[PDB]
């Protein structure tokens, strides 16, 4: 069985500069990571799509994409976007963007650009905050600057469900 894990972060690119470093670190510990992100800014062979091929798929020498049109009214369900991935080549699926979900979540605080503490609806799911300034809790707390430790806490969490 394979797990999924959220990565909440308030306004401010950060988590992309963060994750940009946590991914490799995760490979480092032999973890094959998958990432299901959710945006708003909406995304080759584009025309051929607007022409009518709902599902288009471009393959190349290095990578292959798969597009799937849904002017239906959807595409928020994770569990489905999951089954879509080749999960036999994955160990952990990172989940960023989807708001209001019941999966393990890891916050992210970085003062200066933004507000002050206590801001963290510690859902009955959140399992650790990652600040750059100390602070209390009732759940793990990491230094949003030690990718290594973070990578390690994560790997830990995993093996303790698995």
Q: Please say which residue, 85 or 140, places its beta carbon nearer to a copy of itself.
A: 85
Taking CB under 8 A as the criterion, the residue among 1, 11, 30, 47 binding a copy of itself is 47
Restricted to residues 79-138, the positions that interact with a copy of itself (CB under 8 A) are 81, 84-86, 89-90, 94, 97-98
Restricted to residues 55-84, the positions that interact with a copy of itself (CB under 8 A) are 55-71, 73-76, 81, 84
For the chain, the distance separating the N- and C-terminal CA atoms, rounded to the nearest angstrom, is 8
Q: How far apart are CB 54 and a copy of itself at their closest, in Å?
A: 6
Binding-site residues sit at 12-16, 88-91
If phi > 0 it is left, if psi is from -120 to 50 it is alpha, else beta; for residue 80 that is alpha
Give the number of residues in contact with a copy of itself, rule: CB under 8 A.
Answer: 58
| DSSP secondary structure of 89-119 | G-SEEEEES--S--S-B-----SSSS--SS-
Query: How far apart (Å, rounded) are the C-alpha atoms in residues 24 and 28?
Result: 6
């Amino acid at each position: 069985m394979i797990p999924l894990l959220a990565f909440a972060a308030w306004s401010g690119t950060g988590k992309t500069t963060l994750l940009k470093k946590l991914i490799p670190a995760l490979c480092a510990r032999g973890i094959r990571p998958g990432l299901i992100k959710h945006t708003h800014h909406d995304m080759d062979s584009y025309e051929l799509r607007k022409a009518g091929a709902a599902q288009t798929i471009v393959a190349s020498q290095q990578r292959w994409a798969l597009m799937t049109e849904t002017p239906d009214e959807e595409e928020l369900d994770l569990q489905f976007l999951a089954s879509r991935m080749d999960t036999s080549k994955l160990d952990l699926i990172l989940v960023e963007g989807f708001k209001h979900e019941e999966i393990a979540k890891i916050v992210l605080f970085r003062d200066g650009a933004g507000h002050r503490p206590e801001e963290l609806v510690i859902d009955r799911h959140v399992i650790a905050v990652a600040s750059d300034v100390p602070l209390n809790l009732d759940v793990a707390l990491l230094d949003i600057n030690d990718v290594e430790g973070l990578a390690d806490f994560v790997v830990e969490w995993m093996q303790k469900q698995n």
